[PDB]
Amino acid sequence: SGFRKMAFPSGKVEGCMVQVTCGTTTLNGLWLDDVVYCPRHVICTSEDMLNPNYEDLLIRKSNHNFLVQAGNVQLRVIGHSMQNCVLKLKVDTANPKTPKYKFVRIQPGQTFSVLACYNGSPSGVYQCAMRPNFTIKGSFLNGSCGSVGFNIDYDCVSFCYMHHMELPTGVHAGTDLEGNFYGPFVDRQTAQAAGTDTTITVNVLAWLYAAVINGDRWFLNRFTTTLNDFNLVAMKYNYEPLTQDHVDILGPLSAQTGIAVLDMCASLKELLQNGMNGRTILGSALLEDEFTPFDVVRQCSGV
Amino acid sequence: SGFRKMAFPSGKVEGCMVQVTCGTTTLNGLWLDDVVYCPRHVICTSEDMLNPNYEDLLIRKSNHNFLVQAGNVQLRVIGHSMQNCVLKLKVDTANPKTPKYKFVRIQPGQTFSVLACYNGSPSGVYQCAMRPNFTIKGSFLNGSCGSVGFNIDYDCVSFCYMHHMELPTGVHAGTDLEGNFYGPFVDRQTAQAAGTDTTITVNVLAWLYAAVINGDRWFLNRFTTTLNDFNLVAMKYNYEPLTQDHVDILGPLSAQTGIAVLDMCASLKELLQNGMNGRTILGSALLEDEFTPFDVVRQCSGV
Ligand SMILES: COc1ccc(/C=C/C(=O)N[C@H](C(=O)N[C@@H](CC(C)C)C(=O)N[C@H](C=O)C[C@@H]2CCCNC2=O)C(C)C)cc1
Ligand SMILES: COc1ccc(/C=C/C(=O)N[C@H](C(=O)N[C@@H](CC(C)C)C(=O)N[C@H](C=O)C[C@@H]2CCCNC2=O)C(C)C)cc1
Numbered sequence: 001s002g003f004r005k006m007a008f009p010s011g012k013v014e015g016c017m018v019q020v021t022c023g024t025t026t027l028n029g030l031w032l033d034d035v036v037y038c039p040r041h042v043i044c045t046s047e048d049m050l051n052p053n054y055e056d057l058l059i060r061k062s063n064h065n066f067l068v069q070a071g072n073v074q075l076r077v078i079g080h081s082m083q084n085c086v087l088k089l090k091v092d093t094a095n096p097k098t099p100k101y102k103f104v105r106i107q108p109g110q111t112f113s114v115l116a117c118y119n120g121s122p123s124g125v126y127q128c129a130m131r132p133n134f135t136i137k138g139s140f141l142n143g144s145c146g147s148v149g150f151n152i153d154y155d156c157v158s159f160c161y162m163h164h165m166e167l168p169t170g171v172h173a174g175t176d177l178e179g180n181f182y183g184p185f186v187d188r189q190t191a192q193a194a195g196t197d198t199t200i201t202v203n204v205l206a207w208l209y210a211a212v213i214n215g216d217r218w219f220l221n222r223f224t225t226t227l228n229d230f231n232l233v234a235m236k237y238n239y240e241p242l243t244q245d246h247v248d249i250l251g252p253l254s255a256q257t258g259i260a261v262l263d264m265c266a267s268l269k270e271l272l273q274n275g276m277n278g279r280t281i282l283g284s285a286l287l288e289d290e291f292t293p294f295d296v297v298r299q300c301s302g303v
Numbered sequence: 304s305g306f307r308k309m310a311f312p313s314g315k316v317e318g319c320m321v322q323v324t325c326g327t328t329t330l331n332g333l334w335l336d337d338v339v340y341c342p343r344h345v346i347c348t349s350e351d352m353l354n355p356n357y358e359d360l361l362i363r364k365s366n367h368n369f370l371v372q373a374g375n376v377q378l379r380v381i382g383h384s385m386q387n388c389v390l391k392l393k394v395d396t397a398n399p400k401t402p403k404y405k406f407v408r409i410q411p412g413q414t415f416s417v418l419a420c421y422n423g424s425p426s427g428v429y430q431c432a433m434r435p436n437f438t439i440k441g442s443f444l445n446g447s448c449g450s451v452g453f454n455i456d457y458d459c460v461s462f463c464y465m466h467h468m469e470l471p472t473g474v475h476a477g478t479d480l481e482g483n484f485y486g487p488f489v490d491r492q493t494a495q496a497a498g499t500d501t502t503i504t505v506n507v508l509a510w511l512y513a514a515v516i517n518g519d520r521w522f523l524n525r526f527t528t529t530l531n532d533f534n535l536v537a538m539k540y541n542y543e544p545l546t547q548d549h550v551d552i553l554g555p556l557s558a559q560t561g562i563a564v565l566d567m568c569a570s571l572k573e574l575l576q577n578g579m580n581g582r583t584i585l586g587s588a589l590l591e592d593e594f595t596p597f598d599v600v601r602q603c604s605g606v
Binding site for chain 1: 304424442443473518
């Protein structure tokens, strides 16, 4: 019993992290086979950051301009290319710690673990969600760029995020590992702001199911609702609409607890309209939306 | 910027986890050098759990009665001994992945990371505190025993917790790696309950400092307080007393923000007496007490 914000074990990703230095900018790289992937603004100075000309900056760089260290072992770069917002540094040694891996572009509302790194060395691991406005609420300082987000599917690490920038909201934006940004953002210091965020409704419902599984059931009421009636209330409280696909995804949790999805939706409607009146659910005074249904199943069933 | 409940990277501990099976009970073991450490109730059946005679159960076990697997590699046990509540299984191979390590007994109010495992394989990692009543609020299912808690100090893993039991509160109890329980608990199915928990005051104050560092400052008021006046209010709200040692530990955060500790204490006193009136601090509607001052410094300074 018990329910915690739980990250994937990070050892497979830890063996992939290296330090990339170009001139005076230093950030992290991801060393897979004989390629190092890292954010392309590693080739920038700060005068190259309000309107950087990346292609111009790159043509003036030769292979030796990139200092890549893995521990106290320097790796020699023997090739470089730019793909979208990411640099690919070909190195003369293949990483012996390379795990089985995939590059994935995740959808809004999905969660992943972040291994935060500085100078190529791990700092900590935590769990994030891709917000509906294509930001993430992370924890990143200067020098954390090149940190990656991932999921572990049995043996395979599915890399889905590489860190690039902070919006002055304290929220964070980045790319998939092909260098395509999540959301409308660009890798320049200009006036970009994220759209308004919304609450991930299917995730809140998964979390209420985790609550019931853990014995915190006070919020269950005697009522039911229709999907359309529920969505009309949710919308007023800035919740995303719940689709029938979402209902289907909650099937396993519904069957484990014997609570129909539309019955749990009636309980959530009452929580939205009435508040919690001082009470907590799973130790939280707010409704939580960064646990997917698969997250809940995995935690409440032992991987 | 940003602040998240962050766990230590778990790769060093992952290479140490194995599966220990004795008869029909299976749990996790910690393989360090040529010794496997695991909870001694691995030798129990359930009829041996209301009043187990561990020494009696153990004398009837021979080395071959312990099946230890590390991946799809079986390790041969060549010796066994019981130390307090933990079994030590001598094995004929030293773990090549053994990191530099220490066995530590932590104090109430300190935090650590838990690598939750089942059948010797990692499930997830999360951050816990040793509560003042010597429990932890974890996430453990059947088969998670032998999971360990740890801190990473630069290169050294300081193992401080091994998981043994769940109290029907949904809270968890265990031993240090010498097999001595934290708190008054014993490894039997009887009627044990933990003492009343209290809020870890120095940790709440560290978290308010993290809030200020991150730009969430609405709760700062114009006042100061004495240490004695503060402790009189805190006590009524089931907060532990703040000592001068605690004040000293907050020195670095106080100097970074320019807020005296006693000034931050006046702000916390007002939060305790008045509530938050709907507002959140760092996204929480409750005051958080599972970040130590070192936690906050480490996260807000990049390891
Ligand atoms: C007026 O409304 C505004 C709206 C948006 C912005 C800035 C977006 C921006 O420029 N973010 C910068 C950034 O992330 N730059 C990237 C690099 C550029 C080329 C995209 C970066 O520094 N990346 C860091 C290097 O690793 C990590 C950052 C910085 C440290 C703070 N936290 C982090 O994640 C911040 C430093 C302000 C400013 C004003
Ligand atoms: C009337 O007030 C009460 C007060 C306390 C208790 C029980 C304490 C207990 O017996 N806990 C058991 C336990 O943790 N047993 C240990 C082993 C014994 C020998 C100490 C165990 O099973 N350990 C599990 C094996 O790995 C992990 C447990 C179990 C699964 C649930 N979550 C967990 O962490 C629970 C299964 C109820 C009961 C009633």
